[PDB]
Every structure is written in C-alpha cells, then in structure tokens.
Amino acid sequence: PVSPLKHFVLAKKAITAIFDQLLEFVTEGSHFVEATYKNPELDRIATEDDLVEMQGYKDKLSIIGEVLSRRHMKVAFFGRTSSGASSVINAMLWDKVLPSGIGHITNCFLSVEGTDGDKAYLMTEGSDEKKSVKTVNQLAAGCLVRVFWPKAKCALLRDDLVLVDSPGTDELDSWIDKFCLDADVFVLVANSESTLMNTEKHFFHKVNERLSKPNIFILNNRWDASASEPEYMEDVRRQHMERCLHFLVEELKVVNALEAQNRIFFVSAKEVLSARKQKAQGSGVALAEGFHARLQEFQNFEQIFEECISQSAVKTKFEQHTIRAKQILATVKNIMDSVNLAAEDGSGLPKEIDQLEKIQNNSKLLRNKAVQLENELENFTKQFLPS
Ligand SMILES: Nc1nc2c(ncn2[C@@H]2O[C@H](COP(=O)(O)OP(=O)(O)O)[C@@H](O)[C@H]2O)c(=O)[nH]1
C-alpha cells in the first residue's frame, strides 16, 4: 500500500545526511592537514598539495549538498491539443489544478510543484512574487509558468514529484530542451479516437537523440469514447497497441515489445478526475461504463509510472555523486596514510617524538572516519542502487 515514490524521497534524505557528515569530515580533515603543513617544527609531514586537495574537496562537497537538496523527480506530458494532457495531470493530482485550455490557451509550459504553504500560487521567470493562481494565468525565447499547489492536498507533490504540461505538439523542438533534460519520464498523451501522428512521433525522436535512454509512456486517452462495445473495443485496442508498440520497440527502439506492455495504457482521464474530485461527498457519476476497468487501468499506470520514475530518478540524480564521494574518501585515506608514514619516518628526537605520535593518532582517527563514511556509502548503494 505504500507509494513507490517514497523510495526517492527516502533516498534523498539518506544521501543528504551522508553528504552533511561527509562535508563535516573533510572540513575537520582539512584543518588538520593545514595545521600539520603550517607547523614550523615539522619538515614536510603534510605538504601544500596535501592541503590544497583537501580544501578543494571541502569547497566541492559544500556545493554538492546544496544541489542534492534541490533535486526532485520530474515527469513531462505531451500531446496534441485536447488529447487530455492537462486532464491527466489533474487526475493524478485529484483536483482541477490546471484548467482545460493550457497550455494551448497560454502557449507555454506549466509545471506543478508542491508548496509547504496552504494557498496555491504562480511564479514566472526572472521574478519571485507569488501571483494568484490560474486566476492570473490565462495571461502570464521559451516560456514557463510554475504552478505551486498545497502539498497537503496531493500525495504526489508531497513526495517530491513535479509535473509539467507542454503546449501541445500541435513547433518547434530545440527550444523545449530548456525544460526537458531534467525530466525522468516523458509521457505521450494520445487521442484514442484518432491515431498516432508523426508530429507527435517527431518530438520524441529528438528526445531519443539527446537523452540516452529515456523512459517513455503512452497514454491513449479518451478511451471512454470507444466503450460499451466489447468486441469493437478489443479489436480497436489491438490496432492502437500495435502502432504504439511499433513506435516504442522499433522506431525509437528504446524498449523491447515485452517491457513495452508496461509502457502503454488505455485510459479516461476525465472519468478518473470526476471520480476523484467527488471525494467530499463520499459516487455519481462516470461517462460510458466500462468505467471500473478503465479506472483500474489508470491505477496500474500510476503504480508503474511511480515505480519507474522513482527508481530512474535515484540512479541518474544520485549515483554519480555517490561515486564522486567514494573517490574523494579514497584520496583522503591516502593523504592520512601519507601523513602517518611521514610521521613515523620522522620526516616526509626528544619531545618532537611526542608531537609526531599525536599527529599519527589524529590521522588514524581521521582515516578510521573515512572508513565509516565509506561504509555508509556502500550501505546506501546496497539499499538504493543495486544491482
Ligand atoms: N470524453 C473524454 N473527454 C476528455 C478526456 N480527457 C479530457 N477530455 C476533455 O477534452 C477537452 C480538453 O481536454 P484537456 O485536458 O483540457 O486537453 P489539453 O489541451 O491536452 O490539455 C475537455 O473537454 C476535457 O474534459 C477523456 O478521457 N474522455
């Protein structure tokens, strides 16, 4: 019963804590080497290069924890106008957050992120005032209007997801990149009353140029309009499936035809939205029906989406920082070894002996500490990054 998204938020809390401990350690470590380097009583027990390295790791690590804290999952929706992109987003949020017409109405992107506040509001580029919501939106060289919405009202925003609507793929496809390469999942919202178009196809090819292997979903929306016809429904679906498959598996072969079953859904976002928005009254009603089978299909989509995006986003957003921290800790271990050795070797003795043995001792506590943080990084990769 617990959202797969929890995985990412859990990971973010873990990696955050580690890089705090880690920055704390390298700072302490850096003061030491500096102390030892600058000591006049000492002859090269620690070098200036030793110091500079440490100071560099300190100034680095400091900046990594900053960017970690600002990291979220991002899903991006595309579709011809009136395919139902905005409805899908609203259905996932359980409320009419985005109004029908956007971003055809506005001709720009609309992100939806959570706020810790309790009032919704808008924010544009190069400005930090909080315009009142959509109220002032039909108004608001690319273009982005960020919608904030109370975390207390949507689970997905509470759990670090950001949702983006495009203006519909009803030109161009180079200026969007300004919004996209952050994205962990791209969703093609298709109109099931009509067929997969090339203008739709064409935009995902450019994503599949640039991004290495992007996670792509296809939602065949408006599925209600082909309903109530059990034998018609099933032969129609087969034809949409086969063209949807042919676009994922072969023309963008970014998935094989068995993993692709878990990438393609038939869905009625309007049905799901109405059903969800009604939870203030305790059930009436839907459009054709059919309607329980559709609503389950949307829920299976949600669950798979959330498995996919959480796991993908942890890899591409946390793994390399972890690798970088392993290499950092290894170089620091080396530097303690180097100081410790230089110190039993006298150089790189009355009571000088006793200053040196204290230096040896500090370096070993530091090295031992590098080793705990190493252990915490492996424990991290074990829980959040296997295999
Ligand atoms: N019958 C039906 N209508 C839908 C569905 N999804 C959206 N709509 C309707 O289609 C129109 C436009 O949908 P919208 O989400 O605003 O399209 P967008 O421009 O891609 O954002 C509105 O009348 C919606 O209520 C659906 O699954 N079934």
Q: What is the resolution of this structure in A?
A: 2.7
Instruction: Quote the Cα angle for 133-134-135, to 5°.
Output: 85
Dig out the tokens for 99 from the structure. 């109004």
Q: How far apart are CA 230 and CA 289, in angstroms?
A: 11
Dig out the tokens for 271 from the structure. 């049905």
Strand order in the sheet with 215-221: 131-132, 121-123, 144-150, 109-115, 161-165, 73-78, 185-191, 215-221, 264-266
What DSSP line would sit under 42-96, residue for residue? -SSSS-HHHHHHHHHHHHHHHHHHHHHHT--EEEEEE-STTSSHHHHHHHHHTS-
Dig out the tokens for 342 from the structure. 């230089």
Dig out the tokens for 383 from the structure. 């829980």
User: How distant, in Å, are the alpha carbons of 31, 42, 340, 353, 364 from that of 45?
Assistant: 14, 6, 8, 13, 14
Q: Which atom of ligand 1 lies nearest, measured to the CA of 223?
A: 27
What DSSP line would sit under 168-212, residue for residue? P----SSSTHHHHTT-SEEEEEEETTS---HHHHHHHHHHHHHSS
Q: Which atom of ligand 1 lies nearest, measured to the CA of 221?
A: 27
Label residues 45-81 b or e (16+ Cβ within 10 Å = b).
Answer: bbbeebbebbeebbeebeebbeebeebbbbbbbbbbe
Q: What's the domain count of the chain?
A: 2
Q: How far apart are CA 3 and CA 385, in angstroms?
A: 18
Domain edge (last residue) among 288, 317, 346: 317
Question: Same domain, yes or no, for 95 and 215?
Answer: yes
Nearest CA to ligand 1 atom 1: 222
Q: Among 77, 80, 82, 170, which is best to mutate for testing ligand 1, by the most ligand atoms less than 8 A from CB?
A: 82
Cβ–ligand 1 distance for 47 under 6 Å, the answer no
Domain edge (last residue) among 317, 345, 367: 317
Question: Same domain, yes or no, for 360 and 381?
Answer: yes
Question: Same domain, yes or no, for 82 and 115?
Answer: yes
Give φ, ψ of 186 to 5 degrees: -115, 135
Three-class SS of residue 110? strand
Question: Same domain, yes or no, for 276 and 292?
Answer: yes
Sequence-distant (6+) residues with CB within 8 A of 193 are 222, 225, 226
Q: Give the residue carrying structure tokens 């204290």.
A: 358
User: How distant, in Å, are the alpha carbons of 74, 81, 332 from that of 183?
Assistant: 5, 21, 34
Q: How far apart are CA 25 and CA 374, in angstroms?
A: 12
Question: Same domain, yes or no, for 193 and 296?
Answer: yes
Q: Is the peptide bond before 285 cis (omega within 30 degrees of 0)?
A: yes
Q: How far apart are CA 90 and CA 221, in angstroms?
A: 13
Nearest partner of 296 among 326, 341, 266, judged by Cα: 266
Q: Ligand 1 centre from 164 Cα, in Å?
A: 16
Question: Same domain, yes or no, for 253 and 187?
Answer: yes
Question: Same domain, yes or no, for 47 and 131?
Answer: no
Cβ–ligand 1 distance for 215 under 6 Å, the answer no
Q: How far apart are CA 60 and CA 81, in angstroms?
A: 45
Quick one: angle between helices 352-384 and 291-344, nearest 10? 160
Q: Which atom of ligand 1 lies nearest, measured to the CA of 82?
A: 17
Q: Ligand 1 centre from 73 Cα, in Å?
A: 25
Sequence-distant (6+) residues with CB within 8 A of 295 are 271, 272, 275
Nearest partner of 287 among 299, 270, 301, 300, judged by Cα: 270
Q: How far apart are CA 274 and CA 276, in angstroms?
A: 5
Query: Dihedral of the CA atoms 26, 32, 35, 38 (nearest 10)?
Result: -70
Question: Same domain, yes or no, for 387 and 374?
Answer: yes
Please say whether the beta carbons of 45 and 36 come within 8 A: yes
User: How distant, in Å, are the alpha carbons of 28, 37, 319 from that of 58?
Assistant: 10, 17, 20
Domain that holds residue 304: 72-317
Cβ–ligand 1 distance for 290 under 6 Å, the answer no
Please say whether the beta carbons of 205 and 253 come within 8 A: no
Question: Same domain, yes or no, for 124 and 98?
Answer: yes
Question: Same domain, yes or no, for 336 and 374?
Answer: yes
Cβ–ligand 1 distance for 81 under 6 Å, the answer yes
Domain edge (last residue) among 260, 282, 317: 317
Question: Same domain, yes or no, for 67 and 30?
Answer: yes
Question: Same domain, yes or no, for 286 and 347?
Answer: no
Nearest CA to ligand 1 atom 9: 84
Q: Which atom of ligand 1 lies nearest, measured to the CA of 80?
A: 20
Q: Ligand 1 centre from 178 Cα, in Å?
A: 27
